[PDB]
């Protein structure tokens, strides 16, 4: 999606240049990603998935650090505490999936 926006903006014309720009971590990448995130939820999952509430869609926002920020009220659904638990993020692609 960032590559699509980079090509559309005229910054680059090929996929490889867009990938290089993304890997360089430029401010344009974050400017694109802020709008790319909107309306594109991610499925968060904690294993074991005992019931269907173990997979839940959340609208993501960019945050600092390397840890996923999870709403406390969802913890009971995930059986998730914050003593070292880990979560997986899956990105739906098609409009019907979103």
């Amino acid at each position: 999606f960032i590559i699509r926006k980079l090509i559309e903006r005229g910054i680059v014309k090929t996929v490889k240049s867009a990938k290089k720009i993304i890997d360089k971590k430029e401010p344009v990448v974050w400017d694109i990603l802020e709008n790319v995130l909107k309306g594109h939820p991610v499925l968060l999952n904690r294993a074991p998935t005992l019931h269907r509430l173990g997979i839940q869609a959340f609208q993501p926002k960019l945050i600092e650090g390397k840890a996923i920020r999870l709403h406390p009220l969802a913890c009971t659904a995930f059986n998730a505490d914050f003593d070292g638990d880990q979560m997986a993020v899956h990105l739906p692609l098609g409009p019907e999936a979103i």
Binding site: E8, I11, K38, H40
Partner: peptide, 17 residues
């Protein structure tokens, strides 16, 4: 100008919305 057009179309609601 291209950046401005892309910015205009970026902040629009997504097609599913």
């Amino acid at each position: 100008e291209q950046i401005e057009v892309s910015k205009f179309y970026e902040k629009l609601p997504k097609p599913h919305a």
